[PDB]
Each structure stands twice: as structure tokens, then as C-alpha cells.
Subunit: 494 residues, 4 copies
Amino acid sequence: DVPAPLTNLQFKYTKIFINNEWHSSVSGKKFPVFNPATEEKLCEVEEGDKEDVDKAVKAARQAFQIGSPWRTMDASERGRLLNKLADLIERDRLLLATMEAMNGGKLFSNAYLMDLGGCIKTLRYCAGWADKIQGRTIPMDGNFFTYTRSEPVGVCGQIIPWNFPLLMFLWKIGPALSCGNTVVVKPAEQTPLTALHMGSLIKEAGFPPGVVNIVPGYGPTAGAAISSHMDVDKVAFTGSTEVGKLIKEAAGKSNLKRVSLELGGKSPCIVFADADLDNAVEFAHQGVFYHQGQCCIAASRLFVEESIYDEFVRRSVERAKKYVLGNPLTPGVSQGPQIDKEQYEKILDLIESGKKEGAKLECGGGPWGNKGYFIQPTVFSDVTDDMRIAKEEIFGPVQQIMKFKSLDDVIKRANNTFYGLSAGIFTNDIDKAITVSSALQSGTVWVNCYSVVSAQCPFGGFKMSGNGRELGEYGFHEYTEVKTVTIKISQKNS
Amino acid sequence: DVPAPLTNLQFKYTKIFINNEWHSSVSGKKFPVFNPATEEKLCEVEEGDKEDVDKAVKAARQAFQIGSPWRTMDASERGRLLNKLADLIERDRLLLATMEAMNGGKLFSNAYLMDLGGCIKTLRYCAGWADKIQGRTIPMDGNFFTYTRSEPVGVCGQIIPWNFPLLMFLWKIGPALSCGNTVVVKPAEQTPLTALHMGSLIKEAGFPPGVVNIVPGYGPTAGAAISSHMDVDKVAFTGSTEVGKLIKEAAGKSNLKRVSLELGGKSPCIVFADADLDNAVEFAHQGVFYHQGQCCIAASRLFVEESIYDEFVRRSVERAKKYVLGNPLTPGVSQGPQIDKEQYEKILDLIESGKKEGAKLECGGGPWGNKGYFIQPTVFSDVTDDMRIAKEEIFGPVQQIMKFKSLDDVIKRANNTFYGLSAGIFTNDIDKAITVSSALQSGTVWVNCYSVVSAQCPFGGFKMSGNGRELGEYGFHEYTEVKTVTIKISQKNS
Amino acid sequence: DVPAPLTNLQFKYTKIFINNEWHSSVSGKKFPVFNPATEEKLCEVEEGDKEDVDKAVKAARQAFQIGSPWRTMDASERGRLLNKLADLIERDRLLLATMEAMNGGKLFSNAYLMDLGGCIKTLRYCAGWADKIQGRTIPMDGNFFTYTRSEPVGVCGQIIPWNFPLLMFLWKIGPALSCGNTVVVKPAEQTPLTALHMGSLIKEAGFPPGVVNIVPGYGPTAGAAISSHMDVDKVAFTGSTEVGKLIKEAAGKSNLKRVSLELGGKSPCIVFADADLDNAVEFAHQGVFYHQGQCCIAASRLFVEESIYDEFVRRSVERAKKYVLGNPLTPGVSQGPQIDKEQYEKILDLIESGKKEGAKLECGGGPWGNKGYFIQPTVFSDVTDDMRIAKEEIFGPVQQIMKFKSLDDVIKRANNTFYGLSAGIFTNDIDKAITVSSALQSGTVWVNCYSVVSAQCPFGGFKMSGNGRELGEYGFHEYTEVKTVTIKISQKNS
Amino acid sequence: DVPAPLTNLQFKYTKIFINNEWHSSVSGKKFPVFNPATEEKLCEVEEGDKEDVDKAVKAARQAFQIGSPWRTMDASERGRLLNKLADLIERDRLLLATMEAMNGGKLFSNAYLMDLGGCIKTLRYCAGWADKIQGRTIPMDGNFFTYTRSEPVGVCGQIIPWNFPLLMFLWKIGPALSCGNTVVVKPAEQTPLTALHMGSLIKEAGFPPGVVNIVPGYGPTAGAAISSHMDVDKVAFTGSTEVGKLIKEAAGKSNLKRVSLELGGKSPCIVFADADLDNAVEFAHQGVFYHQGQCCIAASRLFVEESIYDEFVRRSVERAKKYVLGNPLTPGVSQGPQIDKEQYEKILDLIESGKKEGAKLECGGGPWGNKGYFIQPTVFSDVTDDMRIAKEEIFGPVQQIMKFKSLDDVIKRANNTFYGLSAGIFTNDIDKAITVSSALQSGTVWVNCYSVVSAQCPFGGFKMSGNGRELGEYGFHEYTEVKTVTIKISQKNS
Ligand SMILES: NC(=O)C1CC=CN([C@@H]2O[C@H](COP(=O)(O)OP(=O)(O)OC[C@H]3O[C@@H](n4cnc5c(N)ncnc54)[C@H](O)[C@@H]3O)[C@@H](O)[C@H]2O)C1
Ligand SMILES: CCCCCC(=O)N1C[C@@H](C)c2c1cc(O)c1ccccc21
Ligand SMILES: [Mg+2]
Ligand SMILES: [Mg+2]
Ligand SMILES: [Mg+2]
Ligand SMILES: [Mg+2]
């Protein structure tokens, strides 16, 4: 069960982390970090920019040199180190979860049970792959012995968002380290604090200097320095589709670095008339409203078959009114604030567009309170595909409900988007479960559930929701570069 | 199009096949081979025994020596040779299918469409794996470079039954050759003829001598010579459970040769009340009656939920009366004879036990015609678990129908047998499909179908229905012997 | 046997290939295609541009729709169709090899033995993977059944160069088709002719319309239409590093399409004093001069240990003087022309830079003949790392020889380039073979050989020599898009 | 560095372990356990027999039932439990290592550094595979969705020897538990004590009752009860070739249970004239004399090329005289006793046969001391292939040195044995390293080293040295049973 959050949080790790030391920014500038529930400043953090990135990339390159400790270390030992890191996150779990709740506007019990539990499980999963990343021996033509090495890619720039700050930090470093790479991470400017605490734990677990470097700062400065850097071998980014395009173009213009992207979505959740309604209502509701709707996988287009549509709407509206808004550290609060003013305004503007374009406002639809970025949970019905709320990622607590009559029609409508991160299907019919899931152009498809993410599974997007997969067996091979070695011999035998 | 069968077949390949030559038996003895529909002798074949097997094993060992053509040949070339073999089977498809129909008591159209098509597809599948059987490179502890080789096992003895003589011959040689082994095949005494034709095609395709050797003859003579042989590395057997036990014990007493077994069954087919009855009735019917019930996977315990049981019985009985018995080469005939007198009598005896022990005879139940081993298609209802017909593999056209009320009860009853080759489930419920299939102790579980066998799928038994898998990715690695090579180096890098 | 080439080739396939039909260009324009040995026009070809590409992408999308013949076809059948295609290439092997020799300036005997043999082997390899591309089932946390599908990516745009026109066409289509994709291929403007013949064979083998579409034309027109296209899921490119950058940036600006690139090189070949000199001299010589030096993998920096350097130079110079230049269809000719005027001039310019910057001209160094783009085989010694000939890809018959004393120095010098496609090591020492190959930042490393490329091996570049691998097991999974399907169940069992 | 051993060892776990409780033997009998260095009784242990085995198998079957805690537990959690077990072995390392040294006649510092370190590393390796054992989804022919489950095999009987009692216990349970099986382990009657202490740790780590059951006792009683048991799904055995034959025959006669065997060896170590002699002398020496020669992989035929043979002999004899015999807990002692009187006598008898058959005794050759089973380290030269010491596994500190002149001759001689566990090659030549290792019929082949065993590598024997592999990726799939599930659907798409 869940301890009381800390309150009197004193901050200690506020600097740039390079070669297991803490540096001031080269410019000397700092930037403030705020609690979105109260709008109060938590602390100031060193403002990393291009010159700080260059120092970090240099440290990461040195630590990846042939003969260095990280390169010559047993793979089994990289595994041990990743597990020791997980142990230290268990020790510091109350601190981290408190810190994440304060900085990210996140409900404490969720930060403590879901995010932190996830952080630990991800690292344990990663630790186990370290010495199980293998190459091949290949029966090629002619008198040769041929094998492949699954080498690390090298220096990996890793740029991450503010919605699950610590979990996303570990989704990046875990697999990269497991495969033997070195990294330069750029936490979101809104949420650098848990990442910086992780720096102290990295050094304490015993990772060689240079293996993890962490540069807080802004996007078009520190972020763009990473994507354009001539000595970064690979960039991995989770964020907005818009910035993902800039990353890919920067990668092409500079040194053709490898790119993986996870870009958000407009995921459809399809409820057929033969489905278990109770189960479907709850999963679809959580699917869209979790963490104030700030999930990449939000079930933000809910298609419900005509014969059950009015009932589904009624039950969804009723479910959406059971929230207590407030400070996410306060017991009884069940909905926190949006992350910052930019997102707050983006959401209100999209809610306004829904009213304007004729969607039916069923509940909520405006701000709440007079401190922090709170929006009432909002449901819209009679949404049609041409509306802004049906096409654009809102990233706030706003559900769209739409009706359909035909199986073929709803598949087409589900697929009619540049997005493809995830999808949900609710049905009792075997054939529909298998065939509809095959037809949906989405990287994860849930049947009779939603938002089920686990470290064993590959995760990522079709189309403009992403390139590559993370986690699972398939994610790990993304953090390797394959080398083929072919050795002439006098005579080959099978 | 199914062509007209040949008649008046002249036989040519009647000898023992060793080093791509045809040999008389060492003893000089021959044995007769019959058409079971007519009881007429087709021809005589050289009778292989221990001394013939020894010659065949010597050939197979020589052809497997380091530096030999078959060991030094490109893996891709083993692939090409398997495909060329498939091309020759297409060329000779009418001859082979006729020959199989005559020698095996098999319906011609099925021999031509299913068996021969199967033969060609199996070989094409196998051909493609040849140069895709790969080892690993392994990030082991310490300053070493380590790799594995997936070598062939070596000389493989392969003993096969009379129900699908040609298909089973290719299920054995295809994967063994693909992986680079040499073999000594022992066709069933009832059905040596298509196998011996295959000898001519093997030579004609261009396989080096010694790579396939074929020894017709009896079980406790030629068959047991193989299982006890001190220079056979591996035995693979398809047949009766009883003989499978002898194979395994002979393997232990002699040289600890590797063993794989496929041993027949008493497969349950479970029909829940929520199933599509039309689909279920036909699949369950074919599932038990195909090839005069002479299928290892026969759906020989049909469990039907209480509420639909009487209707299921009525429809199954009605379906079982639509057969025309006779010579399987004659158009219009839809049921041929049992393979020989021993099986004929085994079946009549088991039918008699069903009457005696109180099962309800719904139709058939006795012999037919005045030449050849024909048995009327027989259905028994109100079968209970203690009866001989519910426990023993009958291997004839005899269906058992049983009722159940409880989900847990039927899973337990399904699993309550030493057999475990296959099982069928018929339901419209997603949860039942997944969970019941997980709970059944059977190697292949079909959902809303039955008897669907394909070269891409691993196939074989739980419990006393087998050891190992055949075909698919998994089958192939069981025709390899893994070697680990570990090389000291001055310094390892990831 | 190498047959006599054809002469007086009559051309038939000169159009744009879409939905298994031949189309005029939308503009009506045509462009000429030349024989580079004679400078004579061979024929004119329809000039594809953006509007043609759009038609081709529409066809490829339609053929990829759920329920279409190519999507519902058995994977094994995609395999059979690829093999049938290989059979037709064998039938048409003299025509194709002649055609390639005429259009590409390629030595006929090499076109007939190496390129065409390669073409056939690549397709056979690909055919075999089709029904062996598999997903996973995953023991994820919680009460779920989870599996992955290895789906095709979808519509793949494929842009290819003029050095191995037919081989590169099949390296692209073979794996894409094996995995179930549809494609739009853009042959190099210099060399469209064998590709267009392949169109006729594709139709004749029985591929559904829309599965391969082929658009001849120029780069910044047709090529750039492909890379910017909003409905192309993936672009695959082989060519110059410069254009590769444009492809990657276009992919980012447009629809974030997946990208794979193979970009040429400046591959080092390192000869240690303990090496077999005879073997090393010949491999290094072929390694740089093959196909008039127009190989991506050309061994264009030859590092030779100080103690054997002068002898290595002497023997290399002697080897480089044994060529007869002329028309590559004429018996006895052992060196054909460069592909076109642009390359011709690029090479002469780089040769001139070598003289200017102080390298020692050992032989050749200027043009030959009075028609067609012939350059004398040229060797430079005392080359140092700062020279243009040591840094830039020359793509002509020009060898650079350089000396080294230290193991560490030469590894560093080898790696000091933005390129990383391949490398060669020549030594008798086990430790050097393993450790030096691990240290070289190159995608393929040869030990005591060079230029050994086979369909079973993954192939591609480190750093700015590429992204992704082609062929082998690894190449195939890069023509798949992974989908995770997670189904809620009542209770999971292991 | 190495703590002082404990001395005053009080024993606590002396009983049979079933369902996480301690039971008296059903008969009430106990058997004594001795310290081989002193011949003193350490304690008495409950004597398990057939009826105790039956209780253990019943517990293991119950704990493997569908819906049981072990079956429904997350795979990731099986991993956590295996790591927690490793942590408890780290806590109890001094106790365990002391206990192993006392009971097994093992040098304490080796028990503490090598065996215990190995125990821990094995478990960590296993723990990581738990949630990475995956099945497949398969693009089979026709309108079906097909997947496989890698299920556990079920109840696994595991019979182990006295040479590495704890390490062998964990080599068995680690992989079996990781894959989700339940076990019944039968420790060697000489060395039950560390295994029984492991019982307490299993219960303390939190494994459900019935998952590990441990039955001490004799071979033909408790051992044979396991191999013949009608409800054991699989037997895994490490021991004598003779008993391995009995296991395989019992498996066939009873219920056709799956069998894996690791059976000892007569491994050849080949030193070519071009090898590094210093390195070779030491590795070959350790390779045969480690743990008083009681290693399955002992380098017990040392082939040395003629030109370096006399020098190799001289240096090997000199190396063999640097031992201090005595109590293995006493500092300065570098050779302990043989395990018991039976082995002691077997070794003296084989040493006698060497003298008798004409081998040249270079040093040692008789007993030492007057308490405990000590044999002087013995070297024999001029050994020829017909001698008993060249053919039979001695399992004592006895090295055989033999000469060879020809490469082909020495490969033949190396392979001329029913054994094939391991082999060593010492050479500076690349071609020899690769080709000779390919030609040797041995499951592990070391190049320029020996006895390098790591958890990432598959381990086991060719021919009569074993069936199956342990550890590595390949070992784990041996503890799974594959199930294929095929589900009819309306229409399949790629
Ligand atoms: N998929 C998801 O989970 C989502 C998560 C969050 C928002 N998602 C979506 O994006 C919108 C805007 O949020 P923002 O916060 O602006 O995201 P950005 O994509 O900008 O922030 C992502 C990271 O990129 C760094 N960054 C910014 N500009 C950069 C540049 N030019 N070069 C390099 N880097 C740059 C930046 O500092 C941060 O660390 C949200 O409303 C969501 O729709 C989806
Ligand atoms: C959106 C539906 C709510 C489900 C709650 C949840 O665990 N979510 C919801 C959603 C925001 C999400 C998680 C968990 C993670 O591990 C995630 C990891 C990566 C991306 C999103 C994640
Ligand atoms: Mg932004
Ligand atoms: Mg019999
Ligand atoms: Mg250009
Ligand atoms: Mg014994």
C-alpha cells in the first residue's frame, strides 16, 4: 500500500552531469522549474546549450573507445550494474515519486505505484538482456567462415518529454546501456529533476564515467545540438510529431545518424455491439483520461456501434463526473493539473473548436480553480471525422465519442490518419478480434483492454506515430549495429 | 483437375538403395507387397535385414566424412538439390499418386491432391531453410571470442509407417538433408514402393551417393538393426507407441543415439454449446474418418456439451452414412480399405468391445464386401471414459461421441490419457479459445477447425504421443548438433 | 562455358511499368540511353517524373490493401513466385547479361558469370525466407495473451544506381516482396534497360498487378518525387552519400517514412608483415579495380606494413599493367569504360589532384582511346591521409598505397573517415584477426580475402556509409513493421 | 580476496524436502555422510527411496497444475525469485563453501571463488531468461492464425553427481525454474549437504511449495525411482556413461519421458608445434588436474606434435611436482583427496594398468598419507591409443601424454572414441584454429585455452558424452515443450 508523500523537499542535483561529475552551464545561465499545481518555483537548474552538449558528447565518445572499461567489461556485468541501479531506485522510491509528483503535476499514488514500479521493472527487464544480445554464424557460399557481431551503435543522443519524465528516462538508458552504448540524455525543460537525481544513482551504482551524461535545457538549443551533432551516432526521441520531423531532417543534414522516434497519436478505440459494456466503458475511460489525458496512447477517438451508442455515451459521461481536482500530493485528489500554460491553452482552444464545430458538449468544457493549470474532465459526443478534436492530438482530459454502423467503414475511419501509435478493440467475437486487429494500422492493438504496456513487449508507432520499436526483444536490436566478419579458410564443412 | 489414374502399373524399383545403386538383399530373400483393396500381389521387394542395414550405415557414414562432397557443399546448394527433387516429384506426380493409391488402399483423388501436394510443399519448405540454419556469437565472460556451429547430427536412421508412406518419407528426409545429415530410411513393410521410386529421383536430382539409403524390410529385423546400431547417431520414428518404447530402450542400451518419436494418439475434440454446429460437425467428422480413420491425429474422442449432444449425434450419424465403399482407384468411391488383415481384425475387435461394454451403436459396425479389408463407417454414442473404444487408438473408421456438462470436467477428461498428440476446440468465445487451448496437454490444438497440418508449423506430441517436433523452425534445430567454440584473445570489446 | 554475347540487340521494354502494363510518360518526354564503350545511343526510354511516380504509388497502395490478392496470398506462394522469377532470369540469362554489358560498360563474362549468377542466387535466397518471417508470443506481465505480427511495412520506394543495375534491382525487390511489401523502383537514368526487361518477367511469373512498379527517369525529378511522397511508407536508396542526405531530409520533411541507405565508401585494406603476400596482392588488387573501380566496397586505401611496403608496391604496379582496354563485349578485353562523362571527369580530376598534392604516380594516370570513357589503370604510392585521393571516393581504376608502422596507428587511420562500408585485414595471426576486426568501424570486415559478398550475409555501412542492413536474416526484418497485439484473458498460465 | 573457512560446522538440514517442508524418510532409515580428507562422519541424512520419490513427484505435479501459483505467476516474477535466491547464496557464501569443501574434498579457496561464484552467476543468467522465453507466430498456408507457446515441460526429475555438488544442483534447477517447470532433485549420496541447505533458501526466497523437491539417497533406489516414474515428464542426468544408459532405457520402458544426459569424457587436447608453449603447458595441466582430476572435461589425452614433444613432457612433469597434499581447508594445501574409496581404487587400478601396459611413469603413481583418499599427481608419457589409460575415464590426477606427426592422423585419433564432451587446440595458425575445431567431434572446442565454462554458452556432449545442451540460449529451449495453436479465421492477411 502507499506511503505519505514527502513535503519539505530539498533539492540537491540541479547541474549538468558529465563524466560522473556535476558542471555549471558553460554560459552560467540557469532556468527555473515550477510545480504546475501551485505555479511555485521548485528550484533553478543549470541551462545546457550547444557547448554543454559538446562536452557531453566528448565524454560519451571517450567512454566508448575500444579498450575502455565500458567496452571491455563483461556483458553480464553491464546486467549486474543495471540491476544495482534498480535497487537504488527501490531505496529512493518515496523521494523519486514525490519529486515526480511535484514537478510533473502527477497524482502521487500513481507516481508511486505505476511510474516507479514501471521504472524498476523496465530496468530489471533490460538487465537480463545484456549478455543475451548475440550475433550469428552463417553458412555462406564458398570456403569462408562468416559470423556477425551485434555491436553497440555507439554514442546515443536521447531526447525525452515531460509526461512520464523518469519512466521515459529509463526506457531510453536501460536498453542503450544493456547493449553497451554510451548516451547523452536531454530531459524536457519542464521536468529535469528526477533525471538529475538519477545521475547521482548512476554514479553510486558504479557505471564508468562518460557512460551516462545528462544535459538539462531547452529544445531548439540543447535538443537541436544533439540532433545536428557530427559525432552522435544515433538519436532517439519521444515527443511531438512536429519536433520529430525536425530531428529526422537534422539527422540527414548532418551525419546521417540513425534515428528512432515515438511521436504521439490519435488512437482509435472501437466498441462493437457484442462487447462486454462494463469492461469497455472503464478501459476506454482510463484509456483517454489517465494522467490528465497526457498519454501518447490516449484513446482519443472512441467509435461505438450505433445500437449501443447512446447508452455508451450516458455511462461515459457519468464516469467522467467522478473526479476531485486539486494538488496531486493531497489525499482524495483524483485529477491533477496539466503540465504548463502552453498545453493548458492548447487544450482550451481545442475544446472551444469542438463547441464551435458542432460537437455535443456532455460535461466539463472549461477551466477550474484559480491557481495551477486545471481543466474540468470533458466529454464530447456526436463527433465527426472532419472536426479538429477528431484529428489533432489534444493531450488533455477530453474524450471524443463517435458512432459507426459498418465494420468496413469503421476500420477505414480508424486508419484514416497520419498517426498510428495504438488502437483498442472491444468484442466477444473471435474472428473480429483477429481480423480487425490485423487490419488496423497501429503498432499496438489491445483486445478487450487498453493501455497495457509491459517491458517484454515491443512498443511504437506505424506511420507518423514513429520509427522503430522500444523494449521487448525487438527494441534491443535497435541499439545494436551489425558487423559481418568473413574469414577465408582452406575448406569449409557443414 | 484430377487426372485419370494409371492402371497396369509396371514396377521397376524393387531393391535396396545404397550409395545411389540398387542391391539385392544379402540373404537373397524377397517379400511380397499387396494391394489391400483387392488382396492381389503387386510385386516382390528385396528383404533388407541387419546385414543390409550395416552396408547402408557404412555408406551414410562415409558420405558424412569431413571433406566429403555433401559436407563441403554450399548450404544453398543443398537447398537447390531439395527443390530439384520437388520438381521431379511434380513430373512424376500421376505415377506416384497411382502407386500410393494401389499400395496403401488410399483414395486416388486424395493421394493426388493432398498427399502429393503435401510432398511437394514439404520439400519446398525444407529447401528454403538449408542456408538459414545459423549459429550464434556469444558475449561470454572473460577475454574470449565464442561462437557456436549448428552442425548436422550425422547418420540418421529413419523408420516410418504405412498410412502416408510418401509424405512421411519426405517429412523425414527433407529436414535431415536440409541440415546436412545423411540418412538410412526404413519404409513400412506394407508400403515400400513409393519410397523406392524416390530413390531413382534422388539419384537423378544429383545427391551424392550415400546421402540417402533406403532399406525395405520388416520391423524387428531391419527396423531393430537401425535402433541398435552402434554407428547411427540419431533415430527418428513414426509409428505405434509400443514400438516407440522399444526404439527408445534400444537407443539407451546401444550407443545413446538421439531419439525423436511421433506415436499416435487419442485426440479429443471438444464442442461447446456456443459453437457453429455445421462447421463443427463436418470438421469433427473428417477429423476422425479421413483415410479410413488411419490418421495419427484422429478426433477419436468427441466431447459434445449436453444441451447440443443429441442434435450433434443425429447430424454425425447422418453424415457417416454418405459413403460409397470400394476400390480407391474407381471414380465415385469415397472410402477405401484398411491397410492389412492385422489392422482389420484389431478394428473389428474394438468395435465388438464397444457393443459389449454398452456403447450405443448408431450405424455401421461390421465388415463389407467379399475381397479386401473394408469396414463400414461406424458411429458409437453414449461412450464413457472407461471403455476400450474411449482409451485405445482404433485406427479405423470408428467415431466415439461423449457428453459433458462442465468446462473443468471436460478439460480433465480430455487430458486423462497417456496420449497427447492433438486436440480440437469448437467455440465462439475468445476466452475459452485461448485458455482452454493453454490447458490442453496436446502438441497441436485446433480452434474451430481440425486436421490443419502445414510445413511451417512444428508438429508432434506431448506425453506418450512423442518426443521432439517435426517441421517448422523448431523441427529443424532437432536435426542439428550444437558445437561451442571458445577462442582466447588478448582483449574483448563489445 | 560462357556463351558468345548477342549483338544487334533489339529493344522492346522502353516504357514505365505500372499495374503490370506499360505506359508512356505523362509528359510524353523520352530520354536517350547510351553504350559507354562506344558513345552510341542504344534506345530512348519514357521519362518518368512526379506525375508518373504518383500513378505508380497509387498502384502500389491499392495492391497492398487488406483483402487484396498480394495481402491474402500464402507466404509460401510469395516464395514460389520469387523462384519462378529466378527461373525466368536463368532462361533469359544471355539476353540480360548482354544487355547489361552494353548499357553498363561492363565486361561481358563478368556480367554473365558474376552479376547474373548473383541475381539468381539472391532471388533463391529471398524466396526461401518468405514463409519463415515469424513473429513472437510473449510472456508479458498480467492476465493477457500477447503476440506480435511481422507485417510488411507497405509501399516501398526503391532508388538504385548504375554500377550493378540488375543485381541492385533484385537486392531491392527480392527481400521487399519476400516480406509482402509492394514497391516503386527508380532505376538509374544511365541504366534502365535490364530493369525494364525485368518488368516483363515479373508479369510473366504471375505477380499481381501493382506489386512491382518501375519508373525510369532522373534523380531530382522521379527520385525526389519518391523520397517526398506522402503515401510512400519507406524509401530504400543505394547511391552517393550526397544524395543519401537529401533522401533522409526529404523523408523527415514529408511523412517520416522509414529510411534505409547504402552509400559508398573509402574502405581500408590493411596488410600486416606476417601475411601471405601473393594472396594479399591479388585480393587487394581485385578489391580496388573490379568493374573499372566502380564498386562501393573498393579497397581504396591500401595500408601496408613498412617492412613489406616496397615489395607490395612493386608487385601491385606489375599487376596493374596486365590489362587490355576496349569494348567489354569483345573477347580478350579485360577492362571496359567508366559509365559516363561526369564520372570520367571526376576521376581525371582526382588523378590530377594526386599528382599535384605529391603522391607518386607508379603507372597509368590518363585517358585512353578515342571513343568511350576509358581511363588507364592507375597506381599511386606514398599516399598520405590528407590527400584528396586518400579521402574522397574516386569510383575509378585508381589504387592508393600507404605505409604504416604501428598497429594502433593504422587502426586509428583506418577509422578516421566519415565512411564505414567495409574493410580488409591480411594476417596469419589469430589474435590480430579477431581483435583488429572488432576494432574496425566498418560493416563488413574481410580476413585474408576481400569482396566476398553473399546473400546469406547482412550487408551495409557504419557511419555515413549507410543506415540499415540488406540481405541475410537481418535485412529481412527491416522490410517488416512490428505489431503487438494484447488480448485480455481471464487467467494466464505459463 | 578469501575469508577463513568456518570450522565448527553444525548441520541443520538433513531431511527430505517436499512442499517446502522437511520430512523423515518413509522407512526411517538414514545414511552417513563423510569428509573424504579425514574419513570422519559429518552427519546422517534421511535415506530417500521410491516411496519418498513418489511423495515428491506428487508435490511437483500439484504445483504444476493449471491455475496454481507457479503456473499463473508472471514470468518476470520467476526471474525476480531466481535473483533473490542468488542474493541468499551471496549471504551464505562462506557457509556454503565451507560445507562444500568439507563434504566434497574440495580446495576451499576454489570452492569459495570458483564454485560459489559460478553458482551465483548461473542463477543471475537464468533469472534473466525467464520472461524472454517466447514462442512464434507463423505465416502458415490457408486462412488460419497460428502461434506457438513455449510451455514448460512439467515435472522434471534431476539426478546429479558429487564433483561439483552445488554448482550442478543450480545448473539443473536454474534453467528448469526459469522456464516454469517443477522439479525433483536427487543429489549424489556422497554429497547431499549443500543441496539440502539450498532447500532452506528456496523456501526463504519465496518459491511456492512443490516447485523444488529434494530427495537424498542412493542411485538404484531414489535415482531409479525417478527414471522409471510414470508421472515424471522429463529426466535430466549428469553422471557416468554406464548409469546414463540405464536412465535412457528406464525412460523408454516406462512413460517415454524426455531425456537429457551429460556423461563425462576422454577429451583430447592437441598442441601443434606452432603454439605458444608456456600458455599451452599451463592450460593443459589445469585442464587435467583441476579438482583432483574430477572434471568431466578433463584434458585426459594430450597430443603433442613430435618436434616439441620431449620438451612438453619435461615441462608438464615439472609442473606436476608443485603440489602440497592435505586437508583442503588448510592454508597452503594445493591438492585435496579423491571423493571416496570406490574412486580411489578405480584410479590406482588404472595407474597400475598404465605401468603394466608399458606407459612411461614420469612422476607420482601411488597413494599418499595415511588418512583420506589421496593420490600423488601422476604423469604418464609415451601413451598409445590401445592402453586403458588412453581409453577409459580415470577421474583422478593422472595425465596422459601422446605424440603425433600428422594433422589428419591426430584428428582421427582425437575422434576415435565413443566419448565427445570437449576438446582443446593450441596453435597460432588461423586456418588450423577454424578447420580443426570444425572437424573435432566434441561439444565444446577451446582454442588456445581450456576449461572455460560460462553461463552464456551451451554445454554438452557429442556421441556418448551426452544428449542435449545445458545453459546458454540453447539449453533453455530444452526445458520447454512446444505447443502449436491454429485458429480458423475468415480471411488471413500478411
Ligand atoms: N509522444 C509523446 O509522448 C509526447 C510527449 C510530449 C508532447 N507530445 C505532443 O507534443 C505537444 C507539445 O509538447 P512539447 O513539450 O512542446 O513537445 P516537444 O516535442 O517539443 O518536446 C519533446 C522534447 O523535445 C525537445 N525539443 C523541443 N524542440 C526541439 C528541437 N527543435 N530539437 C530538438 N529537441 C527539441 C523538448 O525540449 C523536449 O525535451 C504536446 O501537446 C503533445 O501533442 C507528445
Ligand atoms: C492512457 C491509459 C491509462 C493507463 C494507465 C497507464 O499505465 N498508462 C497510460 C499511458 C499514459 C501510459 C501508461 C503507462 C506507461 O507505462 C506508459 C509508457 C509509455 C507511454 C504511455 C504510458
Ligand atoms: Mg514543442
Ligand atoms: Mg507392429
Ligand atoms: Mg548525382
Ligand atoms: Mg555409479
